[PDB]
Each structure stands twice: as C-alpha cells, then as structure tokens.
C-alpha cells in the first residue's frame, strides 16, 4: 500500500545561463503532449492517490532534432549553444569516453536479450554495424540545421554526460502496434553516485518528441521541489534501462545461450532498489 517516489528539483543552470529561471516561466507548455500522456494515464496519475504532490507539465518540445538535449536546458536559450554542445558531448562520450567500454557492454547485453523476442541473432559484424549507427545518430551532421533524432541508448549516455539520473514519462505501447522503449529510469551507473547530481532530470516522451517535466510552482519559481513516482499507475517498478553489466568476463557467444549465466547477471528487486536509492532520494509514501 506504499509506492516509491522521488522528490526532485529543477537543475541549477546558472553557470550556463544566469537568466535560465526566467526562460522557464517564459516557456510554452506542450499542451498536445500533456493531454496525450494524461489521457493515456501515464502523466499525473499520482495526483489523485498522492496528496502533497503537484502536477507535472511538459515544457515546449523542439523540431530540429535536439529535443532530448534541449530538455536539459529547460528553456529557449539552449537552441544556438548548449543543445549542440550536449549533442557533441554525447558523441564524444561514445567514441572516446573513459567508460565507453562498459557502456557498450550494457548496450549489447540488453540488445542481445531483446533480440531473442524476435528470434534475431546478430553476427559479430552486425554488432559492429549497429554500434557505429548509434554513434552516427549522435553526430552533428545536418539533415535551419536539422539533426538526426536519438534512440533509447542515447538517453542513457545523456545521463552520464549530465551526471544525473533521468526519469522518462511515456506510454508503453504505440497507438498496440509496437512497444515504446523510452519510458523508465536512466542512471549514470558508470559514474560514482557521489559525483552525480542527486535530483533527477524528469522528461516526457510522446510522438517522437522529448520534453522536460516541471510542476506549475517550479515554472513560476515559487517552489523548488516536486514529486516523480518510480512506478507506473499499477505500482509496478519502472524499467531500469541498461542497468545490467555482464562484465569483461562475459563471453558473448556461450554465456548468452546459458540460462544459468543469464540468471547470475539479471538483477533482482533488491538490487534494483539499491541502485535507485544510490543515485536518487527515494521516499516511500502510503
């Protein structure tokens, strides 16, 4: 009868733009996304069951290909400086990052697991091709410059770039044609929790668009803190994206077929809760 939530604040973006707070109040609300995710029961379902919790509203999304990075700026000012800087940082961390070797293991393992659901078995060359494709999407090559849109794993890398957790509010199915992979929790697991921001970046996804989620009082700058639940409306724990790391001693051929080996790396509920409590302030409310 108790669900885990997280009391978050908006990122202190003073050093990037000293008037960022003013751009938040100035910013539009993505009314199309608000209505969609609310009527889908994904957004603001918690208001009725959890008092002392404000409604979350999506900031204006963009259409230049950097809506994910633009959400990290929470304002109009990101457009001609930061959004591209964050995109470049995203690319750099995948190509020459110090934790890129571990990020690749987390990506490949999850992709291998999800590949079973379709009977897909990648060759060693196809794995190389898919990884290169991910990095290519994070490039700053255009085609008003328009940049390539980003996938699920890019959100996970963004968490490492910002050095802060990312919680995405989204639907589970595509209007049910196909699964939507973006909803869930993204933790900078390759970065020590002590060196990360405590407050998570709360986002919303709808119709191939990303937007930052803020409360009304967080937008008018009258209250610093808001609440995001770490479960769905049915109180099932949110998916932890790329949380499993099989390790360097994981032989991709043999171990993936071994059910005993897979069980030894598949996270339990206790482990998942520990990871959440490590990078976020998780409060249990009745």
């Amino acid at each position: 009868m108790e669900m885990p939530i997280c009391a978050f604040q908006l990122p202190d973006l003073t050093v990037y733009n000293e008037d960022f707070r003013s751009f938040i109040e100035r910013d539009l609300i993505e009314q199309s996304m608000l209505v969609a995710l609310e009527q889908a029961g994904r957004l603001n379902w918690w208001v009725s069951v959890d008092p002392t919790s404000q409604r979350l509203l999506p900031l204006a999304t963009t259409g230049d290909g950097n809506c994910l990075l633009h959400a990290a700026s929470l304002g109009m000012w990101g457009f001609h400086d930061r959004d591209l800087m964050l995109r470049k940082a995203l690319y750099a961390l995948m190509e020459k990052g110090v934790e890129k070797e571990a990020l690749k293991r987390r990506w490949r393992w999850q992709q291998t697991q999800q590949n079973k659901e379709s009977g897909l078995v990648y060759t060693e060359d196809e794995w190389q091709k898919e990884w290169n494709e991910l990095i290519k999407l994070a490039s700053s090559e255009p085609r008003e410059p328009v940049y390539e849109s980003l996938e699920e794993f890019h959100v996970f890398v963004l968490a490492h770039v910002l050095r802060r957790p990312i919680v995405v509010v989204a639907d589970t199915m595509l209007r049910a044609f196909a699964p939507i992979p973006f909803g869930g929790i993204y933790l900078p697991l390759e970065v020590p929790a002590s060196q990360c921001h405590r407050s998570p970046l709360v986002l919303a996804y709808d119709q191939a668009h990303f937007s930052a989620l803020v409360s009304m009082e967080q937008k008018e700058n009258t209250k610093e803190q808001a609440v995001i639940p770490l479960t769905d409306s049915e109180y099932k724990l949110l998916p932890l994206h790329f949380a499993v790391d099989p390790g360097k001693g994981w032989e991709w051929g043999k171990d993936d077929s071994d059910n005993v080996r897979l069980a030894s790396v598949i996270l339990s509920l206790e482990v998942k809760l520990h990871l959440l409590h490590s990078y976020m302030n998780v409060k249990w409310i009745p």
């Binding site: 999304t61 963009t62 259409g63 668009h209």
Partner: protein, 71 residues
C-alpha cells in the same frame, strides 16, 4: 485552436493558437520551438505569405491547418 508548422527536414511543430493571434505571436511561439528569430522567419499558408500586423483569421487559418516555415 491547434495548428501545425512543417519544415523541409525538421519535425512537425504543434502550436496552440487563436484566430485572433497575430503573426508576431506565432513567430514568438515558433522561435520557442525552433530557435529561429522572428525576423528570419518566413511563414507560408495556402500559397500566402503571413505578414506581421495581420492575424491568422486574415488568412483564414482553420483548425488543424498547416503552416510552412522557411528561412
């Protein structure tokens, strides 16, 4: 009222407007979602170029109408 703004290669922008909204009001909204300054924006609807000082109703923009953004 809901309208759309299409570009040559970018995502489709969705705006919440009113028939009485001026073109400056729309450009200020587009700037918020595209990063293009209003004076560098050229808006086209039904072959008509939306000029500042006028409203959406002056070009008879309807519900679910689609504007075309270009530099």
């Amino acid at each position: 009222m809901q309208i759309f703004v299409k570009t040559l290669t970018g995502a489709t922008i969705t705006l919440e407007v009113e028939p009485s909204d001026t073109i400056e009001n729309v450009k200020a909204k587009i700037q918020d979602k595209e990063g293009i300054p209003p004076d560098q924006q050229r808006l086209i609807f039904a072959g008509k170029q939306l000029e500042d000082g006028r409203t959406l109703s002056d070009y008879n923009i309807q519900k679910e109408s689609t504007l075309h953004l270009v530099l």
